[PDB]
RNA sequence: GGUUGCGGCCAUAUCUACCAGAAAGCACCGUUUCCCGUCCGAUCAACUGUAGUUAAGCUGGUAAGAGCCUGACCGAGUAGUGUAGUGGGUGACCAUACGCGAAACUCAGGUGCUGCAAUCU
RNA sequence: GAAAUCUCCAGUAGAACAAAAGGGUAAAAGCCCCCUUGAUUUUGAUUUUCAGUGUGAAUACAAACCAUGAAAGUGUGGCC
RNA sequence: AAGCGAAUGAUUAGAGGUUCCGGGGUCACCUUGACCUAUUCUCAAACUUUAAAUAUGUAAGAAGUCCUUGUUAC
C-alpha cells in the first residue's frame, strides 16, 4: 500500500547539513522569542521532540505562544479553496529569527529619522521605496577606451 | 470497470473561482491554547487595568 | 637532558586466556591475586565459535594489571624465567612489549595443594611522564611526535635496565 | 597516518571548546537555556573550576555574545583575607565560595540580608526567602567536566556559597561524611573539612610519625611556624573578614598594560607576508636543486 | 528465450536503471574488454588520437559495443599490427534494459495476463549517450590515422545512430593540446605513468615533486 | 600583546611533520590518613606548590603541505531551465527569441576573529 | 592459529540503537554501571491522515503527585 | 544539471610499494596470491559535497513607530 505518514518523503528535508551534524549550536536556545514576532521553521532533524510536520519547512509565521521550552507559532496553510490557521508548539531550534522582519523595522526607524530630520529642513523627504528606475543619460567617453571590434569566432570541435 | 483513480486537473482553476482568501484576521486573537498560567494572569492584570481606569475616570 | 622525558614503566598486564570457565578459573584467579598482591578480573568472551567452547558472559580469561614498584619487581621476577633475554620481535611498533610464561605457584611463593598449574602472558606497558595528557577528562590531549614511544626507545631503555640484550636467535 | 584528503575533506571539527576538550556542550545546552517564558532574564552560573594551584569561581550569565561574568572569586586572593597556604583544599575552597557569595550579594545590594549563617555548624541549610522581602539570589553551579562525587572541592564551593547567603539548589549527598546507612550528613565531619579538619589531623599525624614527610611538604606551614590546631584559628579569621570586605580590591597592577604588550610583542613570533614566502620558496628550490 | 531487435531500445525513454541493491537478477555485459592494442604504450609513441563520437541521444547496446569493438580492432590489427594502435572504448553499459515477455503460443491469454504486473525483468544492458559524447576514443602515431579512420568508420556500421570519426588536437588521452603538451614534456613536467602520464603540479610539497620530477628542477638550474 | 576561567560564530579554527616559547599562568609533575573509586591512587578523589621541567600538553611560527574559506571579466553566459513559434528534423533531438543561470575545473588570496572577568618584565 | 583474552596506536562513525527502510546520534540517542517506574492522575489545546470529522499516532503545556540528578534540567513509554 | 584525482555503490586500464595470516623455485634466498599509494575511463530512481530555472513562505505600518507611567495572583 501507499504510506502517508508523519514524516514520509523527508529522507533529505530532516538531513542535518554537511559537516553541520551533531549538536545544535547553543545561540538558538539563547535567542528570545515574543509574543507576535515573525518566525521560520527550518526543521533540524538533529532533535526529534516537538518537530514539525514536513508541510511547515519553510513556513514563516507569528508566534502566539511562548512555553517552557518551546513557542506557539501561527501558520497559514492553504486548504482547498481557502486558507487555515494551523498553531504549532515547536521547539525552540526548530525556528528562527525571520530577517525580513528586522529589515523592515531599520526602514521604519530611517523613516522615523527621515521624518525627524524633515521636520527643520528638508521637506519631501520621499519615504517610499522606489523601484529601480531605468538608468538616466550619461556621457561615455573613449580615453583609452577606443572600442576594439568583435567577430564570432569560427566553429572548432574543440575536442 | 478501471477508471481514473486520483485526479487533481481543475483543482486550482476550482479553488480560485470563488478565489483564495486569507482567514481576515482581527485585532485580538482568539487565546487558546496559549498557556494556562499566562492567561491566568492576563485576566487579572486586565482586571486591575479596568479597576484602575474606572478609579482614575471616576 | 630532561629528566621528565625518561622513558619509565607504566603497567604490566598479565592475562590468561582459557577455554572454559569454573574451579579452574576460580584457582587460576587466586593465583593472579596471590602473585599481583590484587584481584584479576575476569574478561568474558565477545563472541561464540563452537571451536573453542566459549559462550557470551562465560568469563573465559583473567587478566590483572599492576603500576608502580609491585610492578617493577614482577617484571624482572618473570623475564628471569627466561633470564632477562628477548626477541627483536615481542617489541610493539609503539613501544609496549611482553613474552609469555608457564608457571607461577612454586616459582615464587609457597605451593600449596588445589592450585592447579597454568600458563599465561606478560605484557610491559611502558610509556614517558604527561602519560595523564592523554587520559585527563578535561582538556584531554595526545602525546607530540618527539615524545611519541616507539620500538627502538624501549629496546635501549631495555639494555640499560636489567643489563640484558636482544635478538637471542 | 598521512590522513586521506577525503577523510580530512568530510571531517567535522567539533566546536573549538570540544576540541580542546574544556567545555562540555550537552550539559551546557541544558545549563544556559532558559524557560522562554522568562523572556530576557539571565541564568546565572556558578562556575567553580579547580586548576592546579589555583580556585576559579565566577558568577556567569550567558548573552548571544558569549559569557558576561558579574563578580569572580579566585584562591591567590585568599591571601588578603588571611589564608596564605593551601589555597586549593577543600577548605579553600569553601573560603572562596563563601568569598563570591558574599562578593554579589554585596554587589546586588542584597548584602544587608541573606547573611547566609553566622555562626557555621556546616549543616545542610538553603537560604529561605525572607518574607516581604527580594528572594535570594539564585544560582546553579556548573561544575564543568569535574566529576561529581562524595565530598569533593567542587561541592565545598558550593557549600560555601549557600553558607554565603546565595541559594545554590543541592543536596548532601555529595558532601563530605554523608552516610549511607542513613539519610543523615555527618555535622562534625564537615565542620572539620570546612577548617581543614582533613588536613590538621593530617598534620598532625605526620608530626606525631616521621619528621621528613612534615617537612618537604607542610614547609610553609612549618615557614610560618603554626600548628595544625590553630587552622581553625586562621580560618575563621578568613571567614570573618570576608564577610567584612568582600568589595574585592583588586592589586596594585604595576608595569602597565602598555609595557605588557610591547614586552610580549618583541618575543611572539611574526607570520610571514606573502613576498617573503615566495623568496623562501624561490631560494629554497634553487638550495634543494643545486646539483642536488 | 531469443533477444529482441534494437530499435525497442533504442531511445532514452526511461530513467537510469543501474544495476544496484534493487536490482540483482541482472545478466552480465557482453563487452568485457575496453583496451586493445599496445595498451601500455607510453603517450610519447601514440600522439595521434582520434574520436567515434555520437551526434544523437539513443542506448548503444553491449553486444552492439562488442561487436564493433570486435570489427575496428580486426581490421587495424590485421593491416598495421597488433601493436601500432591503443583502442579505448570509452562508454560502459550500466543502463539495464526491461524485458515483459509475452507468450508467443496458441491459448496464450489464458496462461498470461496482458499488461498486469508487466514490470519486465532485466532483459539486458545499454549505455545512455548524450550528444557530443564520445563513444570510442583511439590513441595512435601520425602515421596509421586513415587505418584507424576506416577502423572506425568499419565499427559505425555496428552502432545504432549517427556517429561521426573526429580527429582531435589533445596529445593522445590527456587533456592538452599538442603544443603545450610539449611545451611541458620538453620542460620535464611529465613522467610516464604506463598508459597516461602524470603533470608536474606549481601547487603541493616541494620535495614530493622534486622527489617525483627531478629532471623539471635540473632544466631550472641550467 | 601573552595566559587562564567561561564562552560566541564553529576548520580562515581541522590534519600531518618540524621548530620556537622571555615573566605570568597552564600543564606535566610530587604523596595516599581522611572524602572517594577502580583489579591497579593509571583514571577519579584527597593533600602540598613542596623536588623540577618545558620533554609533552598548551600557545605561536614553517610547509610551492593536504583540507577548509572567500573571490575571479576562470570555466561559462557553459550545462540546465521558464516562456514562444504553423521553427528545423522521420524521429531522436536541435537551433532561435525573450529571461534566469550553474557545478566541477583554472587561478589568486587567506589560514581564526571576538565578548566578559582576572593576571603577566 | 583467520578467528578464544590482553595492551597500544590510527579510527567523523565506515558500529550499536528489538524488529522494514530512511533520517538522527560520539564526554551520545551507542557500550558498561547506579537509582527507579512519568509505561501515573484530571481534562483540555494542537499537528498529521482530514470533511480540517473520527480512529490511530504525535506535540506543547497546566494543575498534581512522583522518578532521577549535586543541580540545571530531563521524564505524560520505546531516538523519529 | 554537476560530481566521483569527494563519501556510499558500481566500474576500465596500466604504474609504484609486503608481514614468517601460504613464494607454488635453492630453510632468509630474482621469484607473480594481495591490499595500499598515486593516476585513468565510464556511471547511478531508491548515491552525493555543490547546485539551478520554474514553482514557494513572510514582510513592505496608523491594529504601526517612539517617549512617559499604570495593573498582574505571571
Redesign the interface.
Known amino acids: 500500500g501507499k504510506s502517508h505518514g508523519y514524516r514520509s518523503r523527508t529522507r533529505y528535508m530532516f538531513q542535518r547539513d554537511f559537516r553541520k551534524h551533531g549538536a545544535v549550536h547553543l545561540s538558538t536556545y539563547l535567542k528570545v522569542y515574543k509574543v507576535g514576532d515573525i518566525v521560520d521553521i527550518k526543521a533540524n532533524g538533529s532533535i526529534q521532540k516537538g518537530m514539525p510536520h514536513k508541510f511547515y519547512q519553510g513556513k514563516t509565521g507569528v508566534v502566539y505562544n511562548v512555553t517552557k521550552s518551546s513557542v506557539g507559532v501561527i501558520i497559514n496553510k492553504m486548504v482547498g479553496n481557502r486558507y487555515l490557521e494551523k498553531r504549532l508548539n515547536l521547539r525552540v531550534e526548530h525556528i528562527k529569527h525571520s530577517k525580513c522582519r528586522q529589515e523592515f523595522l531599520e526602514r521604519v526607524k530611517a523613516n522615523a529619522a527621515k521624518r525627524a530630520e524633515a521636520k527643520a529642513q528638508g521637506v519631501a523627504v520621499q519615504l517610499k521605496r522606489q523601484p529601480a528606475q531605468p538608468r538616466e543619460s550619461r556621457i561615455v567617453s573613449t580615453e583609452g577606451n577606443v572600442p576594439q571590434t568583435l567577430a564570432p569566432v569560427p566553429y572548432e570541435t574543440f575536442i | 470497470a478501471k477508471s481514473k483513480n486520483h485526479t487533481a486537473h481543475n483543482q486550482t482553476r476550482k479553488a480560485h473561482r470563488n478565489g483564495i482568501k486569507k482567514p481576515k484576521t482581527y485585532k485580538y486573537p482568539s487565546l487558546k491554547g496559549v498557556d494556562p498560567k499566562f492567561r491566568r494572569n492576563h485576566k487579572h492584570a486586565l482586571h486591575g487595568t479596568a479597576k484602575a481606569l474606572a478609579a482614575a475616570k471616576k | 637532558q630532561n629528566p621528565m622525558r625518561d622513558l619509565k614503566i607504566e603497567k604490566l598486564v598479565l592475562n590468561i586466556s582459557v577455554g572454559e570457565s569454573g574451579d579452574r578459573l576460580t584457582r587460576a584467579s587466586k593465583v593472579l591475586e596471590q602473585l599481583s598482591g590484587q584481584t584479576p578480573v575476569q574478561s568474558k568472551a565477545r563472541y561464540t565459535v563452537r571451536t573453542f567452547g566459549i559462550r557470551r558472559n562465560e568469563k573465559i580469561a583473567v587478566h590483572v594489571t599492576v603500576r608502580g614498584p609491585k610492578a617493577e619487581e614482577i617484571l624482572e621476577r618473570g623475564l628471569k624465567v627466561k633470564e632477562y633475554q628477548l626477541r627483536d620481535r615481542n617489541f610493539s611498533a609503539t613501544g609496549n612489549f611482553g613474552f609469555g610464561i608457564d608457571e607461577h605457584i612454586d616459582l615464587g611463593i609457597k605451593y600449596d595443594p588445589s592450585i592447579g598449574i597454568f600458563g599465561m602472558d606478560f605484557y610491559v606497558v611502558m610509556n614517558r611522564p604527561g602519560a595523564r595528557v592523554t587520559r585527563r577528562k578535561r582538556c584531554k590531549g595526545t602525546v607530540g611526535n618527539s615524545h611519541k614511544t616507539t620500538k627502538e626507545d624501549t629496546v635501549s631503555w631495555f639494555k640499560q635496565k636489567y643489563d640484558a640484550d636482544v635478538l637471542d636467535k | 597516518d598521512a590522513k586521506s584528503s577525503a577523510y580530512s575533506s568530510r571531517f567535522q571539527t567539533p566546536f573549538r571548546r570540544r576540541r580542546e576538550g574544556k567545555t562540555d556542550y550537552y550539559q551546557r545546552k541544558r545549563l544556559v537555556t532558559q524557560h522562554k517564558a522568562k523572556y530576557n532574564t539571565p541564568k546565572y552560573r556558578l562556575v567553580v573550576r579547580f586548576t592546579n594551584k589555583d580556585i576559579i569561581c565566577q558568577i556567569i550569565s550567558s548573552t548571544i555574545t558569549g559569557d558576561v561574568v558579574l563578580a569572580a572569586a579566585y584562591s591567590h586572593e585568599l591571601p588578603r583575607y588571611g589564608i596564605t597556604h593551601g589555597l586549593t583544599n577543600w577548605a579553600a575552597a569553601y573560603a572562596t565560595g563563601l568569598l563570591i557569595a558574599r562578593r554579589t550579594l554585596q554587589k546586588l545590594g542584597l548584602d544587608e540580608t541573606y547573611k547566609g549563617v553566622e555562626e557555621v555548624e556546616g549543616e545542610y541549610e538553603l537560604t529561605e526567602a525572607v518574607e516581604d522581602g527580594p528572594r535570594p539570589f539564585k544560582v546553579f553551579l556548573d561544575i564543568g567536566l569535574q566529576r561529581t562525587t562524595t565530598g569533593a572541592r567542587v561541592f565545598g564551593a558550593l557549600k560555601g556559597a549557600s553558607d554565603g547567603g546565595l541559594y545554590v539548589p543541592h543536596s548532601e549527598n555529595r558532601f563530605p561524611g554523608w552516610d549511607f546507612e542513613t539519610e543523615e550528613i555527618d555535622p562534625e565531619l564537615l565542620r572539620s573539612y570546612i577548617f581543614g579538619g582533613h588536613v590538621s589531623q593530617y598534620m598532625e599525624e605526620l608530626a606525631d610519625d616521621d619528621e621528613e614527610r612534615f617537612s618537604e611538604l607542610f614547609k610553609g606551614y612549618l615557614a610560618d611556624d603554626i600548628d595544625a590546631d590553630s587552622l581553625e584559628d586562621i580560618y575563621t579569621s578568613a571567614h570573618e573578614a570576608i564577610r567584612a570586605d568582600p568589595a574585592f580590591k583588586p592589586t596594585e597592577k604595576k608595569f602597565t598594560k602598555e609595557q605588557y604588550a610591547a614586552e610580549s610583542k618583541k618575543y611572539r613570533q611574526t607570520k610571514l607576508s606573502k613576498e617573503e614566502r615566495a623568496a623562501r620558496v624561490a631560494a629554497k628550490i634553487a638550495a634543494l636543486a643545486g646539483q642536488q | 528465450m531469443a533477444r529482441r531487435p534494437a530499435r525497442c531500445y533504442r531511445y532514452q525513454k526511461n530513467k537510469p536503471y543501474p544495476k544496484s541493491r534493487y536490482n540483482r537478477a541482472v545478466p552480465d555485459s557482453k563487452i568485457r574488454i575496453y583496451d586493445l592494442g599496445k595498451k601500455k604504450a607510453t603517450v610519447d609513441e601514440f600522439p595521434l588520437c582520434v574520436?567515434l563520437?555520437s551526434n544523437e541521444l539513443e542506448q548503444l547496446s553491449s553486444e552492439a559495443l562488442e561487436a564493433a569493438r570486435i570489427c575496428a580492432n580486426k581490421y587495424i590489427t590485421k593491416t598495421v599490427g597488433r601493436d601500432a594502435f591503443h583502442l579505448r572504448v570509452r562508454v560502459h553499459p550500466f543502463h539495464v534494459l526491461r524485458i515483459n515477455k509475452m507468450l508467443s503460443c496458441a491459448g496464450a491469454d489464458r496462461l498470461q495476463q496482458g499488461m498486469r504486473g508487466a514490470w519486465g525483468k532485466p532483459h539486458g544492458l545499454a549505455a545512455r549517450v548524450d550528444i557530443?559524447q564520445?563513444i570510442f576514443s583511439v590513441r595512435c602515431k601520425d602515421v596509421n590515422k586513415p587505418v584507424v579512420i576506416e577502423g572506425l568508420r568499419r565499427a559505425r556500421y555496428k552502432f545504432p545512430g549517427q556517429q561521426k570519426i573526429?580527429l582531435?588536437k589533445?596529445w593522445g588521452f590527456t587533456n592538452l593540446d599538442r603544443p603545450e603538451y610539449i611545451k611541458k614534456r620538453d620542460a620535464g613536467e611529465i613522467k610516464d605513468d604506463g598508459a597516461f602520464v602524470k603533470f608536474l603540479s606549481k601547487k603541493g610539497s616541494?620535495?614530493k615533486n622534486?622527489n617525483e620530477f627531478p629532471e623539471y628542477?635540473?632544466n631550472?638550474?641550467a
Open positions: 574520436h563520437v557530443g564520445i573526429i582531435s589533445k616541494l620535495e622534486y628542477f635540473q631550472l638550474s
